[PDB]
Amino acid sequence: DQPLAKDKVALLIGNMNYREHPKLKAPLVDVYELTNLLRQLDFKVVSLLDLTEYEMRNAVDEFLLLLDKGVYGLLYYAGHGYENFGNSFMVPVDAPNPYRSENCLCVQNILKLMQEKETGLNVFLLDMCRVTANIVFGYATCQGAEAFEIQGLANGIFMKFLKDRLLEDKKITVLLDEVAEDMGKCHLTKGKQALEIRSSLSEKRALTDPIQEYSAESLVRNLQWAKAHELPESMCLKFDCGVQIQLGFAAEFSNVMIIYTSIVYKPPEIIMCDAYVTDFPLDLDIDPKDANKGTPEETGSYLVSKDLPKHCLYTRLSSLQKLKEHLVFTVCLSYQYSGLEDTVEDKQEVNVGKPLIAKLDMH
Amino acid sequence: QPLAKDKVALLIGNMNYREHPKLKAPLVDVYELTNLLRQLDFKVVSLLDLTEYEMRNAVDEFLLLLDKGVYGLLYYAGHGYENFGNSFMVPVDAPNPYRSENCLCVQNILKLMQEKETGLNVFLLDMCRVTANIVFGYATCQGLANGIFMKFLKDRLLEDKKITVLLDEVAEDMGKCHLTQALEIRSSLSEKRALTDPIQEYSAESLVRNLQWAKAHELPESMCLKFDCGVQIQLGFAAEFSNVMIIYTSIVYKPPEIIMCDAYVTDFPLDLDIDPKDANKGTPEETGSYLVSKDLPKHCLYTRLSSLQKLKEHLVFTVCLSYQYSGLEDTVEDKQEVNVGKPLIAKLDMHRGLG
Numbered sequence: 001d002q003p004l005a006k007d008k009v010a011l012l013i014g015n016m017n018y019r020e021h022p023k024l025k026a027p028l029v030d031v032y033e034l035t036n037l038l039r040q041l042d043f044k045v046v047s048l049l050d051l052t053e054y055e056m057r058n059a060v061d062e063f064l065l066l067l068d069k070g071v072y073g074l075l076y077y078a079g080h081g082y083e084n085f086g087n088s089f090m091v092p093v094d095a096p097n098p099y100r101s102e103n104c105l106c107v108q109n110i111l112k113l114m115q116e117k118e119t120g121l122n123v124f125l126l127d128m129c130r131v132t133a134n135i136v137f138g139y140a141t142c143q144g145a146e147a148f149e150i151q152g153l154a155n156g157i158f159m160k161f162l163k164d165r166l167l168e169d170k171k172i173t174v175l176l177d178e179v180a181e182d183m184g185k186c187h188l189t190k191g192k193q194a195l196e197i198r199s200s201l202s203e204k205r206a207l208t209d210p211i212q213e214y215s216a217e218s219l220v221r222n223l224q225w226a227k228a229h230e231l232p233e234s235m236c237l238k239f240d241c242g243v244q245i246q247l248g249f250a251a252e253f254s255n256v257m258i259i260y261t262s263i264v265y266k267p268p269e270i271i272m273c274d275a276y277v278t279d280f281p282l283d284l285d286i287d288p289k290d291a292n293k294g295t296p297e298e299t300g301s302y303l304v305s306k307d308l309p310k311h312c313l314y315t316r317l318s319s320l321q322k323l324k325e326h327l328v329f330t331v332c333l334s335y336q337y338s339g340l341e342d343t344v345e346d347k348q349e350v351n352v353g354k355p356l357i358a359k360l361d362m363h
Numbered sequence: 364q365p366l367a368k369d370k371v372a373l374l375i376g377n378m379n380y381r382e383h384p385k386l387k388a389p390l391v392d393v394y395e396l397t398n399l400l401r402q403l404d405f406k407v408v409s410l411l412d413l414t415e416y417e418m419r420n421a422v423d424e425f426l427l428l429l430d431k432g433v434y435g436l437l438y439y440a441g442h443g444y445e446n447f448g449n450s451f452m453v454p455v456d457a458p459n460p461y462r463s464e465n466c467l468c469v470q471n472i473l474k475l476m477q478e479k480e481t482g483l484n485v486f487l488l489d490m491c492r493v494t495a496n497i498v499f500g501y502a503t504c505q506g507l508a509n510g511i512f513m514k515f516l517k518d519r520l521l522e523d524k525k526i527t528v529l530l531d532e533v534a535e536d537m538g539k540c541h542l543t544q545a546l547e548i549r550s551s552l553s554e555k556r557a558l559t560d561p562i563q564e565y566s567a568e569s570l571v572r573n574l575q576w577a578k579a580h581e582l583p584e585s586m587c588l589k590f591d592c593g594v595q596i597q598l599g600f601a602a603e604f605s606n607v608m609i610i611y612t613s614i615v616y617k618p619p620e621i622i623m624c625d626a627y628v629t630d631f632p633l634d635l636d637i638d639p640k641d642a643n644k645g646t647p648e649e650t651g652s653y654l655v656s657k658d659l660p661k662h663c664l665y666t667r668l669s670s671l672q673k674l675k676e677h678l679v680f681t682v683c684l685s686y687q688y689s690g691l692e693d694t695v696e697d698k699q700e701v702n703v704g705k706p707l708i709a710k711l712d713m714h715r716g717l718g
């Protein structure tokens with residue numbers, strides 16, 4: 001008979017900007033594409049980029065609390081990893097050089113924590129660069145870039161093959177076995193990408209299984225998702241000179257938001273009219289040289305450009321998990337009247353609350 | 364179509380532990396898996412009750428057969444345990460409590476297998492609590508019936524399907540059955556390999572594998588022993604396992620002037636540790652032998668030699684005859700020493716120590 005999911009939840013972590021290790025590029029595109037594919041399969045997804053050790057530990061611990069009886073969970077990690085004494089570790093962006101196991105997340109410890117859950121299906125996919133829980137563990141490993149090799153937005157090897165099979169209505173073990181076979185058919189993969197599948201799945205479970213809504217347990221999961229996806233409402237700021245500026249917000253990842261400013265009305269007597277954002281909380285570590293760009297791409301934002309209106313100034317806030325209080329910042333306006341030489345200045349402070357992952361209370 | 368350069372298998376079943384509870388399922392499970400693998404054209408060596416050094420030597424010699432393109436299968440049934448995320452196979456001489464140093468680390472064996480250019484490497488653990496293409500089945504459980512794992516495995520093993528798909532079906536059958544025992548499958552298989560793939564020989568490498576198999580399966584020829592009194596006794600040999608041979612005696616001819624006579628075997632090498640109270644039985648079952656009873660003639664006396672891996676030199680033993688002439692009261696005794704060479708696993712030259 002048809003297997004069903006009580007619910008479907010997923011946590012995706014992509015680490016790229018390492019303080020003491022080579023920077024990676026594939027986790028950005030891989031996490032974004034996997035988020036959209038899992039959304040088509042009706043997963044409630046939280047996707048985080050560039051997490052420190054404590055951030056990673058807190059995110060995994062909170063994901064594990066959602067794993068009630070019958071729930072389908074998926075944890076995906078892309079970034080640096082390593083093996084030591086038969087144990088594999090996920091490397092956070094603040095890890096020292098050389099790698100110390102105390103500063104990394106032990107994959108085996110997470111599998112043991114998952115083993116204690118009564119989940120319908122638990123999928124743990126590691127895309128690293130070097131009474132049953134129904135756990136399926138996909139361990140993909142690739143070599144680090146060659147220092148003297150020639151290096152757009154390309155997918156990593158594993159995600160390239162996984163995205164072609166992930167939407168299939170087949171048992172997840174069968175599906176991953178097909179992925180391993182596709183990679184074995186390619187000669188370019190033969191020495192640069194490996195895949196090991198560990199499974200204790202005893203039932204025909206698939207990511208496409210339907211979901212079985214007003215219970216407290218169900219509401220807790222919906223509420224965590226809803227908070228993590230909450231963007232500030234758009235604001236129309238009215239200045240004394242008559243100029244009106246709209247402040248817009250778009251989501252790229254659960255901890256990455258794009259802010260844009262647009263001139264909605266400029267009185268005829270005003271010619272120059274620059275609106276820009278400033279005074280961001282110090283926790284976010286925003287470099288002002290990268291804020292107020294003429295295009296979203298100049299802020300390092302390539303994936304949500306479709307959902308952004310043109311003729312704005314864009315700013316990328318990419319460390320929202322470090323925001324411990326409300327997001328308070330300033331919108332400055334620098335303008336010049338027709339027939340006059342001096343530039344006039346004005347500003348207003350805005351409070352847009354706790355956006356996206358920050359709504360879950362960061363500590 | 365995928366092909367195997369050759370198909371080799373080593374099956375170990377541990378039951379009679381010195382310091383741990385005795386097990387029964389490995390006897391039946393090893394025997395049944397041997398016959399199924401033989402139908403799939405595997406060259407199989409199946410050993411029972413191995414000590415630490417015996418297990419290490421057998422695994423090391425099995426790993427030497429794993430040349431490029433070969434399909435290997437290693438099966439272990441017996442006590443096992445997990446410690447620090449590592450699993451260990453427990454030999455019959457292991458002390459209590461368990462120790463990593465006295466047991467075989469499963470992960471160390473997987474690492475040794477990882478270095479081979481095998482076409483397919485299957486490692487199945489049935490425990491009681493150029494890629495290598497490794498598929499690892501890890502079954503754990505907490506009376507002549509099969510063990511749980513082998514019961515489900517034997518219904519699927521002969522299928523012409525990819526070994527990973529086949530083991531996934533086994534895990535699903537156990538998940539349906541209320542009776543069930545856990546199963547974890549670890550795989551790095553990137554090609555469509557199956558135990559049913561055909562074998563693709565006169566090369567030296569091919570001949571080395573055939574020779575190891577041939578030696579491990581060599582039984583002594585049947586013998587007709589002729590005694591001075593005219594009595595003739597036929598001595599027979601049957602294989603139950605690679606280290607377990609059944610010996611049987613029968614009176615083929617008794618001269619009319621001999622009113623009664625009995626024959627029996629004695630003086631086995633001390634390495635074999637044969638208890639004479641268990642030898643010369645009227646039925647094979649009384650010797651602890653019930654799997655090969657079909658291939659044994661009736662009305663013989665049976666003796667089970669079950670530790671052939673401990674035989675260092677030729678198997679030399681005595682056939683005694685006690686008889687009585689018609690018209691006489693006293694019983695006449697006679698005996699003949701018999702040398703049957705090194706049978707089965709003993710033909711591979713058994714030694715003290717490691718390597």
Ligand SMILES: NCc1cnn(-c2ccc(NC(=O)N[C@H]3COc4ccc(Br)cc4C3)cc2Cl)c1
Pocket residue numbers: 009010011044045046051054055056058059060062063066221222224225228321322357360361362363
């Ligand atoms: N530097 C400051 C700092 C230190 N720690 N943290 C921190 C604390 C808490 C979290 N919590 C979190 O991610 N919760 C998610 C887990 O994934 C899913 C998946 C599905 C659904 Br439905 C809901 C959720 C909820 C994250 C962080 Cl990064 C910040």
Ligand SMILES: NCc1cnn(-c2ccc(NC(=O)N[C@H]3COc4ccc(Br)cc4C3)cc2Cl)c1
Pocket residue numbers: 371372373406407408413414416417418420421422424425428572573575576579672673708711712713714715716
């Ligand atoms: N206490 C005395 C003592 C100590 N060590 N040993 C000992 C030494 C060597 C072996 N060698 C062994 O079993 N070789 C087999 C391995 O499996 C296969 C599989 C397929 C084919 Br084709 C051929 C073979 C050859 C066994 C033992 Cl028990 C005895």
